[PDB]
Design a protein around this motif. Structure first.
Motif, PDB file in Angstrom:
ATOM      1  N   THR A   1       1.199   8.540  10.540  1.00  0.00           N
ATOM      2  CA  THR A   1       0.584   9.731   9.967  1.00  0.00           C
ATOM      3  C   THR A   1      -0.518  10.272  10.862  1.00  0.00           C
ATOM      4  O   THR A   1      -0.697  11.492  10.947  1.00  0.00           O
ATOM      5  CB  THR A   1       0.026   9.466   8.574  1.00  0.00           C
TER       6      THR A   1
ATOM      7  N   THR B   1       0.675   5.661  -0.593  1.00  0.00           N
ATOM      8  CA  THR B   1      -0.035   6.861  -1.018  1.00  0.00           C
ATOM      9  C   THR B   1      -0.933   7.389   0.092  1.00  0.00           C
ATOM     10  O   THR B   1      -1.096   8.605   0.234  1.00  0.00           O
ATOM     11  CB  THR B   1      -0.841   6.603  -2.288  1.00  0.00           C
ATOM     12  N   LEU B   2      -1.502   6.502   0.909  1.00  0.00           N
ATOM     13  CA  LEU B   2      -2.311   6.982   2.022  1.00  0.00           C
ATOM     14  C   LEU B   2      -1.469   7.656   3.094  1.00  0.00           C
ATOM     15  O   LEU B   2      -1.990   8.492   3.837  1.00  0.00           O
ATOM     16  CB  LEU B   2      -3.110   5.834   2.629  1.00  0.00           C
TER      17      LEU B   2
ATOM     18  N   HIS C   1      -0.406  11.222   1.303  1.00  0.00           N
ATOM     19  CA  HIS C   1      -1.488  12.183   1.125  1.00  0.00           C
ATOM     20  C   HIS C   1      -1.734  13.011   2.376  1.00  0.00           C
ATOM     21  O   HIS C   1      -2.268  14.121   2.275  1.00  0.00           O
ATOM     22  CB  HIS C   1      -2.763  11.451   0.710  1.00  0.00           C
ATOM     23  N   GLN C   2      -1.356  12.502   3.546  1.00  0.00           N
ATOM     24  CA  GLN C   2      -1.435  13.246   4.795  1.00  0.00           C
ATOM     25  C   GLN C   2      -0.085  13.727   5.296  1.00  0.00           C
ATOM     26  O   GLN C   2      -0.035  14.660   6.098  1.00  0.00           O
ATOM     27  CB  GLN C   2      -2.088  12.390   5.886  1.00  0.00           C
TER      28      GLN C   2
ATOM     29  N   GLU D   1     -11.669   8.980  -1.037  1.00  0.00           N
ATOM     30  CA  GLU D   1     -10.397   9.407  -0.468  1.00  0.00           C
ATOM     31  C   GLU D   1      -9.224   8.953  -1.322  1.00  0.00           C
ATOM     32  O   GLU D   1      -8.452   9.775  -1.834  1.00  0.00           O
ATOM     33  CB  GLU D   1     -10.261   8.860   0.954  1.00  0.00           C
ATOM     34  N   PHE D   2      -9.113   7.634  -1.510  1.00  0.00           N
ATOM     35  CA  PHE D   2      -8.053   7.048  -2.319  1.00  0.00           C
ATOM     36  C   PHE D   2      -7.836   7.848  -3.594  1.00  0.00           C
ATOM     37  O   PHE D   2      -6.737   8.359  -3.845  1.00  0.00           O
ATOM     38  CB  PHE D   2      -8.400   5.595  -2.652  1.00  0.00           C
TER      39      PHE D   2
ATOM     40  N   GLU E   1      -8.729  10.914  -4.549  1.00  0.00           N
ATOM     41  CA  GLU E   1      -8.206  12.260  -4.365  1.00  0.00           C
ATOM     42  C   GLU E   1      -6.762  12.225  -3.891  1.00  0.00           C
ATOM     43  O   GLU E   1      -5.966  13.090  -4.274  1.00  0.00           O
ATOM     44  CB  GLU E   1      -9.082  13.046  -3.392  1.00  0.00           C
ATOM     45  N   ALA E   2      -6.394  11.209  -3.103  1.00  0.00           N
ATOM     46  CA  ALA E   2      -5.013  11.102  -2.651  1.00  0.00           C
ATOM     47  C   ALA E   2      -4.069  11.099  -3.842  1.00  0.00           C
ATOM     48  O   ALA E   2      -3.143  11.918  -3.920  1.00  0.00           O
ATOM     49  CB  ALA E   2      -4.829   9.845  -1.803  1.00  0.00           C
ATOM     50  N   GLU E   3      -4.329  10.221  -4.814  1.00  0.00           N
ATOM     51  CA  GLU E   3      -3.492  10.192  -6.004  1.00  0.00           C
ATOM     52  C   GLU E   3      -3.476  11.549  -6.683  1.00  0.00           C
ATOM     53  O   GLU E   3      -2.417  12.018  -7.119  1.00  0.00           O
ATOM     54  CB  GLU E   3      -3.977   9.110  -6.966  1.00  0.00           C
TER      55      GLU E   3
ATOM     56  N   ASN F   1      -3.666  14.478  -5.320  1.00  0.00           N
ATOM     57  CA  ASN F   1      -2.681  15.261  -4.585  1.00  0.00           C
ATOM     58  C   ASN F   1      -1.272  14.893  -5.021  1.00  0.00           C
ATOM     59  O   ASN F   1      -0.464  15.766  -5.361  1.00  0.00           O
ATOM     60  CB  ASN F   1      -2.861  15.043  -3.086  1.00  0.00           C
TER      61      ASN F   1
END
Ligand SMILES: Nc1nc2c(ncn2[C@@H]2O[C@H](COP(=O)(O)OP(=O)(O)O)[C@@H](O)[C@H]2O)c(=O)[nH]1
Lengths: 69, 420
Positions: free
Chosen positions: B139, B176-177, B180-181, B397-398, B400-402, B404
Motif C-alpha cells: 500500500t 483494514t489498514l 483504508h489506503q 487512524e485505526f 477512522e479506517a473502520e 471508511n
C-alpha cells in the motif's frame, strides 16, 4: 484425438505419481520394521548380560565358606 | 507499446509472480534460459528477454526460494531489492520504519523501469492483505506511485482472509489498514481467497493433493487471461482501460471478483463437450469463481467476459442475452446490458477455447461486513495493539479506517436496491 492424447497424459502421470507415493510409504514401513529389530535385540543382549553378571555375583557371594585356622 | 510493470511484494506475491512468469513464458514460448524457442518482457543484448519486474520483501530468503525454482533465471539479478530485519507481520514495520528507508530505492528502480518504456499503460501488483511486509509495503508503494503517475491506472491482485480459518491471527488489522489506503488510490482490486481456490482444485478438478504451486498456477491463468486479448489479435480487442470504464461506475465500487474457464478433471473430461454453452455455464457457476462470496446472494453492477479462441460471435451475444434475461433478478436492472464481452484470436496452449470472467458485483460487501465485524470485535478489547503503537502510530487512524470501511459497504448495499 488431441484431447485423448492429453487425457492419457494426465492418466499416466497420475497413475505413476500414486504408485511412487505408495512405494515411499512401503519404504517407510520397512524402515520402521528395521528400527524395531534394534529394540528387539539390545534388550535381549542386556537381559542376557544382566543374567550372567548377577549369576556371577550370586556365585562370588556364596563362595564364602569357613576358615578354620 | 502499452507495457506493464510487475511490482511484487510479500511471499505470496512473490510465489504468484514466479508462477505467472512461468505461464507467460511457456505461452510466449520463452524457455527458462531466457530465449525464444514488448508488452511484458524487455529485449536484452545477447538475445535474452529479461522480464520487466521488481521484487520487494523484508526477507532475502524469498530471494533464494524464487531463484531456486525454474524460470528464476529470467528475473535479472538487479531487481531483487530486499530488506534485512523483516516485518514479522506488523503493518507499521512494513509501512513506517522499514518502508521509509528502502521504499526510496524501490521508487528509484521503479522509475528507472518506467521511463525506459514508451507507453507504460498500467501497473500490476502481486501481494497479500495479511502479512506486514506484503500489505504494508504494497500500500505504501501504491500510494507513492499514484502520487508519482496520476495518469496511469492501478490494479492489485490481493489475497484476503479466508472466512473459515485465518493464517495470521492479526489478519483483520492489517487487512483494514491496507483497505483504508487501497480504496482511495487503486482501480482494480482483484480479490482472491485461499479457500475458494481450495474448493476449486478439489471439487471441480478432483485433484486430491493440491499444492500452492497449483493454486498459484490457477491464479496465474486468471491474471494472464485478464489481458491476453491485448497482446494478441482479435475480432474485438479491449485493454486494461476499456475494462475500467466497462467495470467501475463510480470512484469506489471497483473491487472485482475473478473467474476462469474451462476446468475439468480427468474423469469428466472424456464426456463433456466444449462449446460456448459449457464455457458460459462454468463462467457464471457459483463455485467456479475465486471469491469467498457466492455471487448469487447479491447482484452485479457489471461484469466483463474476455473469451479466447477463434470462434463465432452470435453464440456469444445470444448467450449473454440469455444469461441476462433468465438470471435478471440476480443481475441489477437500473443499468442496461450490464455485461460486456471481448474476444481474442488465440486460446491457451492445449485447448481451443477459454474464458476469463471479471465481475464488479455487490456480493463482496458481505466479505467486508465480516472483516469490519472482526475488526470491531478485536478492537473493543484493544487486542494486539501495543505492536501497532510501539512503532509510531496512534489508535486514532485505526478507528477512522473502520469508519471508511463502513462508508464503503454503506454504498454497495444501497445501489443494490435503488431503482428508477
Ligand atoms: N494462494 C496463495 N496464498 C499465499 C501463498 N503464500 C502466502 N500466502 C498468504 O500470504 C498471507 C501472509 O501475507 P504475507 O505478506 O505473505 O506474510 P509476511 O511475509 O510474513 O509478511 C498469508 O495469509 C498466506 O496465506 C501462496 O503461495 N499461494
Amino acid at each position: 484425438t488431441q484431447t485423448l492424447e492429453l487425457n492419457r497424459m494426465r492418466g499416466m502421470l497420475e497413475d505413476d505419481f500414486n504408485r511412487k507415493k505408495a512405494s515411499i510409504r512401503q519404504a517407510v514401513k520397512e524402515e520402521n520394521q528395521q528400527l524395531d529389530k534394534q529394540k528387539r535385540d539390545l534388550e535381549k543382549q542386556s537381559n542376557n548380560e544382566k543374567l550372567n553378571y548377577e549369576r556371577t555375583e550370586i556365585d562370588m557371594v556364596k563362595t564364602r565358606g569357613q576358615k578354620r585356622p | 507499446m502499452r507495457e506493464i510493470v510487475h511490482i511484487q511484494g510479500g511471499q505470496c506475491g512473490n510465489q504468484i509472480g514466479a508462477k505467472f512468469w512461468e505461464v507467460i513464458s511457456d505461452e510466449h514460448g520463452i524457455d527458462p534460459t531466457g530465449t525464444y524457442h514488448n508488452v511484458y518482457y524487455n529485449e536484452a543484448t545477447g538475445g535474452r528477454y529479461v522480464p520487466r519486474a521488481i521484487l520487494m520483501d523484508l526477507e532475502p530468503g524469498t530471494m533464494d526460494s524464487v531463484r531456486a525454482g525454474p524460470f528464476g533465471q529470467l528475473f535479472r539479478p538487479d531487481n531483487f531489492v530486499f530488506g534485512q530485519t523483516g516485518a514479522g507481520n506488523n503493518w507499521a514495520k512494513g509501512h513506517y520504519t522499514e518502508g521509509a528507508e528502502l521504499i526510496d530505492s524501490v521508487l528509484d528502480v521503479v522509475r528507472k523501469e518506467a521511463e525506459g518504456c514508451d507507453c507504460l499503460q498500467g501497473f500490476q501488483i502481486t501481494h497479500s492483505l495479511g502479512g506486514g511486509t506484503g500489505s504494508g509495503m504494497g500500500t505504501l508503494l501504491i500510494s507513492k506511485v499514484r502520487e508519482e503517475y496520476p495518469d496511469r491506472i492501478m490494479e492489485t491482485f490481493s489475497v484476503v482472509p479466508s472466512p473459515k480459518v485465518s493464517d495470521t491471527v492479526v489478519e483483520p488489522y492489517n487487512a483494514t489498514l491496507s483497505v483504508h489506503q487501497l480504496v482511495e488510490n487503486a482501480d482494480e482490486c482483484m480479490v482472491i481467497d485461499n479457500e475458494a481456490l481450495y474448493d476449486i482444485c478439489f471439487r471441480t478438478l478432483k485433484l486430491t493433493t493440491p499444492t500452492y504451486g497449483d493454486l498459484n498456477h490457477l491464479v496465474s491463468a486468471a491474471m494472464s487471461g485478464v489481458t491476453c486479448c491485448l497482446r494478441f489479435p482479435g475480432q474485438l480487442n479491449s485493454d486494461l482501460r476499456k475494462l475500467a470504464v466497462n467495470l467501475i461506475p463510480f470512484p469506489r465500487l471497483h473491487f472485482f471478483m475473478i473467474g476462469f474457464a474451462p476446468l475439468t478433471s480427468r474423469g469428466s473430461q472424456q464426456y463433456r463437450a466444449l462449446t460456448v454453452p459449457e464455457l458460459t455455464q462454468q463462467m457464471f457457476d457459483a463455485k467456479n469463481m475465486m471469491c469467498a462470496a457466492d455471487p448469487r446472494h447479491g447482484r452485479y453492477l457489471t461484469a466483463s467476459a474476455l473469451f479466447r479462441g477463434r470462434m463465432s460471435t452470435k453464440e456469444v451475444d445470444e448467450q449473454m442475452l440469455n444469461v441476462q434475461n433468465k438470471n435478471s433478478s440476480y443481475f441489477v436492472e437500473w443499468i442496461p446490458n450490464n455485461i460486456k464481452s471481448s474476444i481474442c484470436d488465440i486460446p491457451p496452449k492445449g485447448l481451443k477455447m477459454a474464458v476469463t470472467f471479471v465481475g464488479n458485483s455487490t456480493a463482496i460487501q458481505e466479505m467486508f461486513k465480516r472483516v469490519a465485524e472482526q475488526f470491531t470485535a478485536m478492537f473493543r478489547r484493544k487486542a494486539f495493539l501495543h505492536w501497532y503503537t510501539g512503532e509510531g502510530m496512534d489508535e486514532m487512524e485505526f478507528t477512522e479506517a473502520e469508519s471508511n470501511m463502513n462508508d464503503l459497504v454503506s454504498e454497495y448495499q444501497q445501489y443494490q436496491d435503488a431503482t428508477a
